């Protein structure tokens, strides 16, 4: 009975064992629960040994009941066994051993996800939520110690900027991993609480993680170094002397010594002394920085004194782009805000004045028509560019004045003006107006290639009927607009695209036919200018009109359209160059004929002029112009009449007779068809030489009698 009470005390000093969850690390709690469960199992298997039950059976045979009730009820063995076996599946494996040896922040993150996924096994256990919260606090304390050790080894302070930034980026993503894994665990304990309303009466958490204040310190460090870097950027940028004051070198040395004196102070000390050192360092840094901040603001004032235009003010406001958040230059922006709004309003009114002139009345339509842009797509590009400049102005104003410039009266009327300009600058209505016009008109090419149409030309009462190719200019402009608007993101309907593709596949024949028709019309106009040579190009005009009459029966979808177009272009080009060469050589022939009157009376110059005329007529015969001998005969009568007039002058100058007469009378006649050989016919004297000059005598042969009366 005494040893039974000894056993009762020996297991009552163990079954009442409990560890405070707020004290110690998490691993101490894990080891305590494992050791308590193992020792409880050890005294359980020692309790169930048969000799102990033999002593209880002996004491039951001795009617000593009180020891048996003490060993049955006052033990507390079963409740503690249910406690250590209820907490067993959470406690079996636990991942802080990987965290304690981890050295890299991704290993910290994967140990965090391992720990928080192992924490998900609370839902099948009777673990108290408050003890779980203190366990989470101990996990946070171990996290803070481990990453403080990692950050102390990495020495983030004295080292360069970019990799220091990336290690705090990885640390802050580790903090974000802690945040959302705690969110998942918190809703897990919330759904656990929703099943045990009458059991747990402690709703709120009020958890304060130990690392969090250090996180705030790192956060402060983040923006602090960011500010310093931005300040150093403008301090190497704008501080150059505009073409060497001691103020700029004093600013570079003040920034350098301020950063050195704040580099002396350690920032990883999370304690109260470290906190007051941090605060003193930042107060000293702000006191050192505010002087060069006032210098920067004063130089901004002096730089804005000489700035006139809106783009100038925007370009110099964007020089101090990294200092918009420092709360001293914001007052300078606030003082100069009204001038910025007024001058941007003037720029908006200038753009509104541009758009006030309509598109066909402006030079932009003319220069787009020069650079091969159809007018509706040019108007769309014009309106889109004015809208893009309006958006750029609003973007610049919003970026310099901060988000929240709407609430002022000037800002709200500027926004009203921009809204009015933007709803005046819509481009969709022009597009479906064009689409409605094209779909109503219902273009497309088919049928035969040519078209005769009779118009009323001014200066002529009779209606002149002309020939064109069956290809409207609106077809070509529609193809251009489809190719332009399909680029611009605008949805064009199916029939318009199919018509444009048919036009694009039929275009190279149509443009060549248009060029050939225009060349033929211009050459016929040039022929109709000079009526005297209409019978020389009768064969070429007959050939070209035969080709036109052959090709007028062709259809657009024919197979004969490919060589016929090339044949027509070649024939019209040959006809045009023949007519131009004929014009040049006929001007030469007329100049040589009109120079026979002023040529002085001798045989040699007359023979040379006649040889030049014969050479020109020979070159006419080489290219085989039609009806050459008739035109040569019509020229021959004229030059014989001119020779008769010159014979009158030469005979009346004399008033040895035949020696003076043979100057003109032995001149060779003009031979039209002289390239022919083989026919052995000999021309007589009257058709080889001008023997009929006395028949073309202008005053009659009476002057010849005046030549005969003097002898």
């Amino acid at each position: 009975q005494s040893g039974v009470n000894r056993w009762i005390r020996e297991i009552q000093k163990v079954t009442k064992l409990d560890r405070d969850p707020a004290s110690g690390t998490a691993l101490q709690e894990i080891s305590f629960w494992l050791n308590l469960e193992r020792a409880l199992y050890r005294i359980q298997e020692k309790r169930e040994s048969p000799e102990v039950l033999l002593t209880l059976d002996i004491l039951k045979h001795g009617k000593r009941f009180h020891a048996t009730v003490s060993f049955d009820t006052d033990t507390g063995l079963k409740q503690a066994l249910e406690t250590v076996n209820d907490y067993n599946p959470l406690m079996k494996d636990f991942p802080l051993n990987d965290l304690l040896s981890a050295t890299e922040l991704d290993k910290i993150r994967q140990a965090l996800v391992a720990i928080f996924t192992h924490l998900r096994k609370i839902r099948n256990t009777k673990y108290p939520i408050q003890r779980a919260l203190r366990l989470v606090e101990a996990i946070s304390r171990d996290l803070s110690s481990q990453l403080l050790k990692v950050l102390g080894t990495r020495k983030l302070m004295h080292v360069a900027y970019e990799e220091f930034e990336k290690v705090m980026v990885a640390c802050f993503e580790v903090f974000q991993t802690w945040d959302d894994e705690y969110e998942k665990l918190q809703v897990l304990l919330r759904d656990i609480v929703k099943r045990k309303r009458e059991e747990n009466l402690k709703m709120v958490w009020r958890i304060n993680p130990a690392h969090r204040k250090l996180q705030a310190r790192l956060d402060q460090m983040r923006k602090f170094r960011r500010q310093h870097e931005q300040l150093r950027a403008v301090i190497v940028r704008v501080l150059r002397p505009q073409v060497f004051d001691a103020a700029d070198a004093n600013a570079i040395e003040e920034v350098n010594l301020a950063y050195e004196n704040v580099k002396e102070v350690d920032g990883l000390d999370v304690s109260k002394e470290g906190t007051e050192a941090w605060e003193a360092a930042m107060k000293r840094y702000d006191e050192r920085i505010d002087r060069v901040e006032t210098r920067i603001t004063a130089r901004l004032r002096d730089q804005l004194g000489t700035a006139k235009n809106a783009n100038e003010m925007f370009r110099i406001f964007s020089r101090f782009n990294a200092l918009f958040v420092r709360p001293h230059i914001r007052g300078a922006i606030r003082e100069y805000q009204t001038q910025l709004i007024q001058r941007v309003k003037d720029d908006i009114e200038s753009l509104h004045d541009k758009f006030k002139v309509q598109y066909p009345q402006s030079q932009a339509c003319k220069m787009s028509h020069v650079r091969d842009l159809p007018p509706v797509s040019g108007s769309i590009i014009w309106a889109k560019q004015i809208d893009r400049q309006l958006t750029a102005y609003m973007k610049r104003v919003e970026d310099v004045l901060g988000k929240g410039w709407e609430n002022h009266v000037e800002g709200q009327k500027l926004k009203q003006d921009g809204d009015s300009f933007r709803m005046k600058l819509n481009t969709q209505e022009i597009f479906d107006d064009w689409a409605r016009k094209v779909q109503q008109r219902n273009l497309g090419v088919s049928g035969r290639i040519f078209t005769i149409e009779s118009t009323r030309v001014r200066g002529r009462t009779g209606n002149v009927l002309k020939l064109k190719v069956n290809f409207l200019p609106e077809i070509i402009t529609l193809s251009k607009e489809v190719r332009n608007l399909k680029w611009l993101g605008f949805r064009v309907p199916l029939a318009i695209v199919n018509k444009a593709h048919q036009a694009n596949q039929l275009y190279p024949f149509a443009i060549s036919l248009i060029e050939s028709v225009r060349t033929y019309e211009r050459t016929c106009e040039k022929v109709e200018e000079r009526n005297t040579i209409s019978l020389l190009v009768a064969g070429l005009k007959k050939e070209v009109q035969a080709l036109i009459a052959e090709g007028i029966a062709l259809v657009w979808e024919s197979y004969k359209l490919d060589p016929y177009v090339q044949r027509l272009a070649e024939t019209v080009f040959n006809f045009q160059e023949k007519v131009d060469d004929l014009l040049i050589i006929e001007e030469k022939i007329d100049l040589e004929v009109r120079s026979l009157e002023t040529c002085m009376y001798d045989h040699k110059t007359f023979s040379e002029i006649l040889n030049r005329v014969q050479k020109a007529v020979d070159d006419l015969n080489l290219h085989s112009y039609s009806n050459l001998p008739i035109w040569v005969n019509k020229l021959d009568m004229e030059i014989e009449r001119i020779l008769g007039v010159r014979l009158q002058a030469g005979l009346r100058a004399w008033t040895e007779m035949f020696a003076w007469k043979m100057v003109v009378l032995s001149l060779p006649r003009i031979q039209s068809q002289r390239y022919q050989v083989g026919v052995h016919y000999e021309l007589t004297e009257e058709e080889k030489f001008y023997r009929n000059a006395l028949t073309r005598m202008p005053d009659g042969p009476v002057a010849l009698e005046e030549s005969y009366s003097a002898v």
């Binding site: 035969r448 040519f450 078209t451 005769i452 002149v464 009927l465 020939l467 016929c524 019978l535 009768a538 064969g539 005009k541 007959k542 009109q545 036109i548 009459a549 007028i552 029966a553 039609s626 009806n627 001998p629 008739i630």
Partner: peptide, 25 residues
Amino acid sequence: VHDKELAAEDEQVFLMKQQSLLAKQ
């Protein structure tokens, strides 16, 4: 012997005949 000239027709009556050829066929 001298051969008489060939001459292409007047343009107006030529493409008037071709206009009739276009309309009839």
